[PDB]
Design a protein around this ligand. Sequence first.
Ligand SMILES: *Cc1c(COP(=O)(O)O)cnc(C)c1O
Ligand SMILES: *Cc1c(COP(=O)(O)O)cnc(C)c1O
Lengths: 347, 365
Amino acid sequence: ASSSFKAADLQLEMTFTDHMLMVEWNDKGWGQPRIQPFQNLTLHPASSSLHYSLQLFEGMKAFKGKDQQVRLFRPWLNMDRMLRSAMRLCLPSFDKLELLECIRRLIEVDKDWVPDAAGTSLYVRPVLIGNEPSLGVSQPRRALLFVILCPVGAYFPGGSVTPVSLLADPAFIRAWVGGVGNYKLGGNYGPTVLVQQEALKRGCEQVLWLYGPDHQLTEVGTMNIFVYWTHEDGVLELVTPPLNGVILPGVVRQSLLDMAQTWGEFRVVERTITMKQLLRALEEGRVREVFGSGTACQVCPVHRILYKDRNLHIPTMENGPELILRFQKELKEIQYGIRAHEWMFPV
Amino acid sequence: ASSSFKAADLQLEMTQKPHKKPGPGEPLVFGKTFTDHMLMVEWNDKGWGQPRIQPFQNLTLHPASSSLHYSLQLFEGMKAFKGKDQQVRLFRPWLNMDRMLRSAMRLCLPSFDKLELLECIRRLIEVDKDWVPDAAGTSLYVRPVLIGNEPSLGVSQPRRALLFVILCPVGAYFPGGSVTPVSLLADPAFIRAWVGGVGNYKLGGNYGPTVLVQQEALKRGCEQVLWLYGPDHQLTEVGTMNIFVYWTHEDGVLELVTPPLNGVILPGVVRQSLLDMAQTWGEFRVVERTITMKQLLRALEEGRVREVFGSGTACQVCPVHRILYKDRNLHIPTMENGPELILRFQKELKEIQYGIRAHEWMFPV
Ligand SMILES: *Cc1c(COP(=O)(O)O)cnc(C)c1O
Ligand SMILES: *Cc1c(COP(=O)(O)O)cnc(C)c1O
């Protein structure tokens, strides 16, 4: 009472998994967390979740190693992000480690659902919605937190790393400074459906999100973007856009920056990336690799960019892709328990 | 893009046990009290289903519903008014219907026939007619919603959707017919929408992020938010209302100005009505042009501002008396100037809406 829900108070009642977590918030505080069979949600028609998008989510993977032990990849970063998203849309705060322990217990009940094939895992989807039975745009004192799980079977059609189809049109904007693009809110995704369809009929599989008067490369679909090149100063570097408001702080993004910094072989920085710099670098043969990063596709190569209906080839595949494969191998090693690391949380 | 549901295919299920009526003398909070019935229509792979109109009940949604994860949701807001002869009427519902599937087209929900939904809503209000209040400035708020209902976690076009309409009786925004002003926080750090964005559609996603800014307006002691856009600080919206400025322009001409529909402005029904009304009078210049803080600041020190107001069916016309910008107070002359134009707009809209003056803008139920 008077604070957050506790995993020690959990209520147990024994393509998605068999069970789900559910926690309710109402004025005075949180109710106890419930692990119950997968079932439909019953919401009032005036629920603020459906009218004013008082909704946020998270996305992380649970990996089954060779020793058959299930582990979550840096879940503390997902919990940090979830709480920041909650504060912004201006829902109840909760204790990050209590939600983690509740999710741990949920994955434990559905442990048989975690796949062990190469490139497979269990997708954990936590959600927090406003559940106020009112049409007023306000702080929603009733709320609902739920977690659902689902097995995912390899991103790539086989085991071969395949490059993806980008469209770069300045008329479409995902996020803005002073906006809400740095939080995983449902509201940022709905508007992308029409843009993705526009990309598909223009011969592209995904969208390269441009921002500002100087056409800054921000995100690749629902992934962060990275460019491995020799910059205009002659130094070999790995660059990704900074957290200035328009970028979603990805867990894989942070991990790639952390790993590359530890190696100390090349410069690793956060510095926006304009189409002017990319066009110049391509023409000068300074670009090595360009990729997207995210939970779905850990490291995802890009081979051409349709900018103002262009056919700009990105030489990612003819440069190995050396860094992508190194990142993929080291991540697989950490995630599937082949090497012990502080980044993994055992379930 | 697969036609529509028909009003002729609408069945009916009356309530077994009705909700409690508030009563003409007890406090009505906006959007917390609901009527006995609701409209609901489902869409899937075969197309649209039949409506029917059922008792007020909770929605049953799959946990992976795209409405809850990726905000595939939109809404409308219009009012039904009851005159002192018991006749119920809707204010320009065709425009709300026009604002509907444009919103659905955007994120990327099924199309429907505007007149078929209008007939279904008309019938729903007729069923719950006893819920429409009588008192001075009271009304029934009508809330149509269309959501994506896909049972998967992919960010894609839903193969399943749900359209529903709920009703709620609301009190007068201004008691006694006497308009009162609001103060606004103008902080450029928070942006509601951007060009190439989705602020020109009534989608749920544009509202959630405004809750924190509204709370920051409250803490800084200011009656609602003034939404600034760009490095030039363009005045765009007043909370969930369109903005209008009545002043003598820099060129020396008396005018009524409101921002143009360039992508950051929601095309309000009241906004369009005020423009239509002002143009029909032909007493002053009516123009759609960007308004900046620099222009407002210059007009204020030169004494050229007469009235500044917000527009949009909860309030119709809402006066603004103060704007907190750059930690400094800007006293807006709205109130000392009558407020003449606001009172004229309010009287005209009140007379049209409650049927005291007949107009083609009103749709009978
Ligand atoms: C989820 C997401 C990412 C990547 O985040 P990860 O935590 O690394 O999965 C990047 N950009 C957007 C827009 C996202 O939604
Ligand atoms: C609803 C709304 C308006 C006003 O629209 P009306 O149709 O006149 O009710 C204006 N701005 C915003 C941001 C709105 O949501």
